[PDB]
């Protein structure tokens, strides 16, 4: 009954399997900045909301008075653990050490895939039981309709209206568009007469990437003004495999991460509804 049933090569193989599956799977991390590794002991982060927008410019020869930029109501949110557990049989490990060699880590890959899709689900449609808001469910959301996406350009026009609304809230710059796979597959079509596909016209309109996410439901999308000032991914601990101690000589592990999505500006999100 050890504290470590795996050798370091086996731990390295398990961990790079988990990391490879997560890096291939995660789409929320492609558009969100990170608040560092906070450490596992950090289980609560400030949740700044910044909904007040006082004109803010002093604009005088000297100093007249404007309201300071601060959290409108200082609150904290607890960082959840996103986890999926898997089991390795002990005779499989003993076979990998003596007999047929490579130590199949397919259960780790399946658990890491489930944990990554739960992370993406938390980022886009946050846990309403735990009180988390996703990108698609944040109160204070800009919202443009899809309109007719079954046209030569209907997707590009929806992104144009979304970026217009985001610009009119003072949120500029590199936009990132995340679409559902129906919408993302629809946009590989001819819109402009130069033969550029409509996805690439949106990609020159959304500078920080157009992505697809299978967690987005139905015909749906989101345009975000990307940046640490608007939204953030507070990571207490990144995705890792932990051994849970031997049960009936078998070896249960868990892939887990602790992270939270912080919408610091819910005006920098326009959903394609």
């Amino acid at each position: 009954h050890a504290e470590n049933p795996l050798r370091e090569e086996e731990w390295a193989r398990l961990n790079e399997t988990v990391i490879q599956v997560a890096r291939r799977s995660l789409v929320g991390r492609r558009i969100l900045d990170i608040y560092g590794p906070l450490g596992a002991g950090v289980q609560t982060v400030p949740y700044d909301e910044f909904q007040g927008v006082s004109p803010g410019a002093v604009d005088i020869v000297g100093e007249q008075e404007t309201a300071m930029v601060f959290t409108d109501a200082r609150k904290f949110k607890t960082i959840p653990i996103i986890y999926k557990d898997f089991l390795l049989h002990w005779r499989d490990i003993e076979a990998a050490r003596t007999h047929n060699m490579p130590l199949d880590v397919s259960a780790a890959a399946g658990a890491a895939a489930l944990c990554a899709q739960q992370e993406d689900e938390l980022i886009f449609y946050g846990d309403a039981r735990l009180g988390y808001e996703g990108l698609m469910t944040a109160n204070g959301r800009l919202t443009v309709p899809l309109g007719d996406w079954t046209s030569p350009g209907g997707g590009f026009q929806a992104i144009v209206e979304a970026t217009r609304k985001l610009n009119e809230q003072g949120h500029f710059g590199p936009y990132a568009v995340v679409l559902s796979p129906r919408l993302y597959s629809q946009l590989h079509r001819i819109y402009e007469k130069t033969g550029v596909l409509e996805i690439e016209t949106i990609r020159q309109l959304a500078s920080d990437g157009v992505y697809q996410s299978n967690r987005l439901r139905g015909e749906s999308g989101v345009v975000v003004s990307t940046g640490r000032e608007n939204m953030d991914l507070a990571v207490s601990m990144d995705m890792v495999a932990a051994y849970l101690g031997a049960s009936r000589m078998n070896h249960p592990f868990r892939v887990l991460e602790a992270l939270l999505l912080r919408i610091k500006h819910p005006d920098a999100i326009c959903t394609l509804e």
Partner: peptide
């Protein structure tokens, strides 16, 4: 302390 790390880009 990141393992997956930032995927920005």
């Amino acid at each position: 302390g990141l393992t997956v790390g930032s995927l920005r880009g």
